[PDB]
Amino acid sequence: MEVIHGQPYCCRELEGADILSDTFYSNELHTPLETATRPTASEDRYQKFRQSLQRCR
Amino acid sequence: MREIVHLQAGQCGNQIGAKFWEVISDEHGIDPTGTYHGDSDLQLERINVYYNEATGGKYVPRAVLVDLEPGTMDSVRSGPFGQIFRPDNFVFGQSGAGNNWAKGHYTEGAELVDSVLDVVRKEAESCDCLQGFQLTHSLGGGTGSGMGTLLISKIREEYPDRIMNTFSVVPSPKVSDTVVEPYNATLSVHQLVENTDETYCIDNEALYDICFRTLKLTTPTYGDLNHLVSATMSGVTTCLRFPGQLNADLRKLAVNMVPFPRLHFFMPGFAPLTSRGSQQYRALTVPELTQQMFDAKNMMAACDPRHGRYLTVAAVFRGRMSMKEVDEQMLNVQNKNSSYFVEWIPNNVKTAVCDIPPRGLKMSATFIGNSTAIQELFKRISEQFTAMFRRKAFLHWYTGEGMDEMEFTEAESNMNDLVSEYQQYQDA
Amino acid sequence: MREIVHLQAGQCGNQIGAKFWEVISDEHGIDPTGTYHGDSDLQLERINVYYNEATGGKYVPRAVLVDLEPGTMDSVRSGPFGQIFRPDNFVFGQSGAGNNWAKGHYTEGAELVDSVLDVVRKEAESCDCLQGFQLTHSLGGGTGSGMGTLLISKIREEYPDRIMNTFSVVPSPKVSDTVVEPYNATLSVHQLVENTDETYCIDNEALYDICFRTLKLTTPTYGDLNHLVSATMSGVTTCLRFPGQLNADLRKLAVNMVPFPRLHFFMPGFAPLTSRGSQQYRALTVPELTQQMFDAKNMMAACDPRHGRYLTVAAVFRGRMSMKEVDEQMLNVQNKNSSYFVEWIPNNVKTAVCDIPPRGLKMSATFIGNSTAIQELFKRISEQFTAMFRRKAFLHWYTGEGMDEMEFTEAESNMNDLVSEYQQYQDA
Amino acid sequence: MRECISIHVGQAGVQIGNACWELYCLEHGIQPDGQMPSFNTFFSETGAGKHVPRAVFVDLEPTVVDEVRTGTYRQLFHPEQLITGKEDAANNYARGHYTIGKEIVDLVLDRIRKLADLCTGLQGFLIFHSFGGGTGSGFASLLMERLSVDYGKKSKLEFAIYPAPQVSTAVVEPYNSILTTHTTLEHSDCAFMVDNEAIYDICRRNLDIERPTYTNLNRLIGQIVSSITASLRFDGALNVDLTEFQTNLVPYPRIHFPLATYAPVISAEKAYHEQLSVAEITNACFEPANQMVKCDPRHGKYMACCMLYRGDVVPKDVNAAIATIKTKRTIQFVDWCPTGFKVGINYQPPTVVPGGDLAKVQRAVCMLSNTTAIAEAWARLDHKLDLMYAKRAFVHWYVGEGMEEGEFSEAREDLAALEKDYEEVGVDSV
Amino acid sequence: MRECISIHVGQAGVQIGNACWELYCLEHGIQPDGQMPIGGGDDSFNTFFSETGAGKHVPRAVFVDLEPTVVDEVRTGTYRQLFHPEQLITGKEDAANNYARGHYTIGKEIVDLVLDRIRKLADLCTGLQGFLIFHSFGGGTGSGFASLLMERLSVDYGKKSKLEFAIYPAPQVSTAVVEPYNSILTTHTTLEHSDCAFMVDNEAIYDICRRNLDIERPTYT
Amino acid sequence: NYSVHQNSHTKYHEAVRKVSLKTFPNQVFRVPLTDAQNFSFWRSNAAGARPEETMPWIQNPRHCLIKSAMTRFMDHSILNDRNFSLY
């Protein structure tokens, strides 16, 4: 369920995968000095990012 | 203005280059949806180097993703930054190669190279001014080594005055990942000592050792591994996307390094790579990055520089620094280590800076080394090829579907010419 | 005050007109109940071109709707935009033509010509200043193929100076919808090369190729099939209805595209065609628009332009766009495709730019092309005709309804003359 | 609007009618008693709210029409529309064509005259007869000879039950088959013909049902004739009227004998396990195992083909389905017809007959094909007569009821000329 | 896209396939009828199953055996609605551990139907990579008719990977007496038309499920 | 299960070929009689009975492959028209 130009659509399936893959999982130690956790660093941040963005197929 | 066409061939390229777009999307402050969200305008003037304009603040990368099977292409469409790519740039066949160079170069590749070439020339013809190409692949299989060499050979005859760079992965000494690795590697290098401008050499076990010892990582994922290659490959092309006190673009880094038209096999490195607990115990200055740039553990290839000599090195520094200390640091390095640099070249060091380091660090530097100790890796591939080829190992899967053994003999002699030339240039 | 009388005979004509009047009602802001609900005054000034007067603040199209069988207009009346049609143009009979050129032109269609001529004369003398007569039909059927050409012959007598545009569906080489199709198309085009002024060849498989390779539609209904022809039909006569900075009506197209009176068969095309999912990665600008108009795969007819040489070319642009790019890339496409143009005509491109776009688009264009590669279409239809006539394969459904054997020979002789005239002018 | 008058003569015709009208009053929502709780093409209207079918039932016996008159259909048909004879023809062309068949043509013709003035635009006749017996052979010819002169140049298409190459339920089968074709040549337009053995092999191969009967046999033919006249009732992308079956499938005046094929013939168990795209029912149409006429198509060459598609079908993939067939080297066509095909699209999905055996599917193809390979069936049907007419078998039942001995000889040489014309037109011109 | 064709031949094919097609619908959410009951997508079953318009998932497997008595329990079991019954091909008599029977006498006619179903499965195949033939070296249908299937498919489908299975006869024991004949006869004509043949021994699994998987009196499970 | 074979062998084989038996061998016998019966006995085939709700220990998130829209279109093309060759 996304809103496009103010009017709601209904989804059946969403983009990507619900889980984070392990071939696209880099630890945060490569970018230590950052201040807002990138969604490729941990699974909770990916889950909140997937909650934030919804797109049908 | 200046503009690089990107290509990703095989599973290795389709993962590593995907991680590269992951790591440079955040450098230019671009969301997965592609809408620009940067806080400074400074990261916006040179977007056109790697991205393409679309309406409403959308930016779309240029990348012709090619592999003979669709599974690894659909894996990267499922990622965090997956929808940025243009779907008509996705080129994929029906059946896989089978980790054989012959099927990736003659059987299936000849029925698919026309379309990927057409998309490549579509992206290159819509260019304000063309500078060069980019390719991520490996020298082990058939869908990354049989297709990448064919693509490079096809590109070279159309744009011969531009520079093509293949960001290749070389076979590992202790443990292999494919049984027919030397057969693929020798034929791939035979097509890479003649066509492309300069390649990079990445070993898997060198990065394994780096994340085990230097990074102190207990469980290194493949993202943890590809992020190193992404950083050391994004650090080279930073002189044409951001200002600097001494900017040195790709063709600048091309004349400075290769002295003779066959000796262009390189070795990268990344300076600031520290463990989690050693952040407070290590100061961050230019000399404490030169201690890691020239470190033998930090080299991403598995040859120790102490068994050979350097011809020229490069060091694309990034950030807050003057360059008395940069230049005097490289001066000290060339002075104290004097016997390991060649005597017939007076100044062996190339330096360049920019004042935009990579995302998440203060200061960084990307080492690049053209050492004469790389001959041992080619020597290893040569006697592995000799050991398999001396009494007809796994050959009929190549011999039965397109070429005879004269091509193998010619490629082996071409490989053995290179080590002899390296030896004759090592002792002046 | 420059009006067009719209005619449609046959199932093709009825359905394509049902889509066309949807497009025109969308452009001029006509509610399907008939009321006018446009927002700007620019849609009101030239509503006279396609519409007439009603009472109560409504508008009635200037279209006659005829078919010999009462089934198709039963669906058109209950269609999506069928309530705007006036009930008095619904003229018809009670029996179908049945895919015969003899049942539409000589016996069954001959007793209905007076009834449709009544309404045609009534709507033609009611205007201020007519310009032309629109006709949509099929050359492979029996109603539109036989009766439509009879209507054309009857109209060219009474109006000799008025121009004529016909939008004809053309047979297929791969598959076929009518078994007796080579016998109707040659007889229809034999009546079309000497009476009409301006003819458009529309193929159905070219539309299938567009909907499957460009539009990327997996289940294309006939509404999406006919919307392309409807868009071309609305884009040809856009300058008569809207202000433009380079005006071009139907007669300007006729003089710029017909150098010799018997060479007036065109290949239409619609510019900004793209897939639904790949819209946001498809930044539309006049370079890529004029690139898309001139491929071989964006043509409404199956005859490939790369095997022939163009004679004259028109391209009517719609929407707010500048003129430097328009003229500059017509210069570019003329000087880069000079091997596909004729040397004896210096400038081979006709351009026109209006200031109003199609509803839902913002920079659209319509490509009209007179090319000598259309000779292969008539060549294959002459081969299909001569492979059936020499055995008298299906002849007796004609000779049993007042035909001659001295009519098929004349039809194939006119076909041969048209082919030889198209071929001769290719030598320069 | 569009119209169809269907005539059901003979035992086979009336029993086929009992199933096709079974289907017809389901496709439109009208009860067995003609009540309703685009239909004008096959059903009339009565001011109180009934629809009365536009068909006549005629048989020389009462024992098949009385079960219609006393069954569940007694309030649907008009009582005078069910013409009843009193003595059968007893498998004689003579009885149905000269003696007793001549007595009740004046009532059947009267009823057709009173059925043809209530319709605004009529354009066809669907005569349901069989080549076997007497009233399906003699009375059908007697009706042809009068409909060809009392109405003019209307379409006159017949559905027949052809004799199988070995299956036959009579001994005078070649005699009755050799004389009806002396009226289905100059008075006919196109003869949609099927046999009975091929449908048996379909019902045991494609359907997993043994010991089939006539009720199961007639529902497939009912589905075939509903697919034929579907475009007159429900609209679609490419409607097909009755007037261009005749001018598409008939190249030469005497060559009008196409086969029939219903593509998705599967059980209710298999329909949910197999998806049936339009690219594979089209290939099943040309499958030799799926023929409803026992004539394997690969000895001969195809002349003209007509495809009738129903339900949720789209023109693009069917276009591609024919596009892959003309490239097949096994399905071989005739040189002088480079065109070959004919398609027609209807939007209504097929409906299952109550208590039936066909599954609830969403697409259907009905394949009508003139084929050179039907000449072998005539080549054995004349061989049967030449083995029978040598010793004058069974002739005294024919010449004893208003027939000449010399008619059999002229029938034989006419059909020999028909076979010779069939061979001559199927040659490659060079 | 990527998928492979399973052919289960003989008892040692079908009794392993009963484990395989239990495990496969256990890995996914595919129910025994095949009707799987918001989030992302799932297109992982395309390697073994094919989706129809009715929502039902049919496996890409053909169950062929000359004997009727050991295939027929899958028509009576749970996976009756899973399979399409035109793949469960049964004969009337077995080969009785004759290579000559299943290779020359009885099995010579069933070939035109199993290749028919193989063509049916391959026409629905988007991208075909491999085959999965589950035969044993012991009996007649697993040795005679399997080799005939391989020699038909080598000339039918050209250069596609044909990976088979083999229950290799034991050193010190055998189920039947004529097995050393049948193994040589089934490896003489398979050595040229095959690409790879997996090798599985019986009592090696018995000692594995005696020592490691410490369960006494093991059986077919 | 009585209604589909009627104590007749021929009716039993017809109902086996047509799939018409209404009872699975889990309700009648509280043990697998046939050995081949044990490869289905735990599975409850009532309507939609799952091995997740009953016995909630074998749950395992699937790292499944998502076929892209481009590959879905390619599959549909190669299935429907053999003459279409995209890329």
Ligand SMILES: Nc1nc2c(ncn2[C@@H]2O[C@H](COP(=O)(O)OP(=O)(O)OP(=O)(O)O)[C@@H](O)[C@H]2O)c(=O)[nH]1
């Ligand atoms: N398909 C089908 N064929 C039938 C049916 N009933 C009879 N037949 C065919 O009709 C043939 C019997 O001869 P008919 O032509 O019906 O005899 P008749 O012309 O009606 O003459 P009478 O029996 O005296 O009424 C048989 O060979 C059958 O093939 C039926 O219900 N369905």
Ligand SMILES: Nc1nc2c(ncn2[C@@H]2O[C@H](COP(=O)(O)OP(=O)(O)OP(=O)(O)O)[C@@H](O)[C@H]2O)c(=O)[nH]1
């Ligand atoms: N452990 C185990 N072995 C089996 C099973 N089914 C078959 N086998 C093996 O099959 C081998 C012999 O092959 P056969 O029993 O003759 O089977 P076949 O080769 O298909 O020949 P047929 O018996 O005629 O069907 C024996 O050595 C068994 O080990 C099973 O369910 N469990």
Ligand SMILES: Nc1nc2c(ncn2[C@@H]2O[C@H](COP(=O)(O)OP(=O)(O)O)[C@@H](O)[C@H]2O)c(=O)[nH]1
């Ligand atoms: N960094 C990285 N290396 C990989 C990945 N996948 C494979 N490799 C390396 O690539 C080498 C051979 O890859 P290969 O299987 O031949 O890929 P292909 O050429 O595309 O078929 C192996 O030594 C692997 O270590 C990956 O996802 N990331």
Ligand SMILES: Nc1nc2c(ncn2[C@@H]2O[C@H](COP(=O)(O)OP(=O)(O)O)[C@@H](O)[C@H]2O)c(=O)[nH]1
């Ligand atoms: N593109 C397109 N073609 C159509 C449509 N309807 C019918 N046709 C074509 O028109 C032909 C049918 O001939 P038609 O004119 O209907 O026969 P007639 O009405 O008896 O003259 C076939 O070849 C179809 O391909 C449509 O909506 N769109």
Ligand SMILES: [Mg+2]
């Ligand atoms: Mg009868």
Ligand SMILES: [Mg+2]
């Ligand atoms: Mg057995």
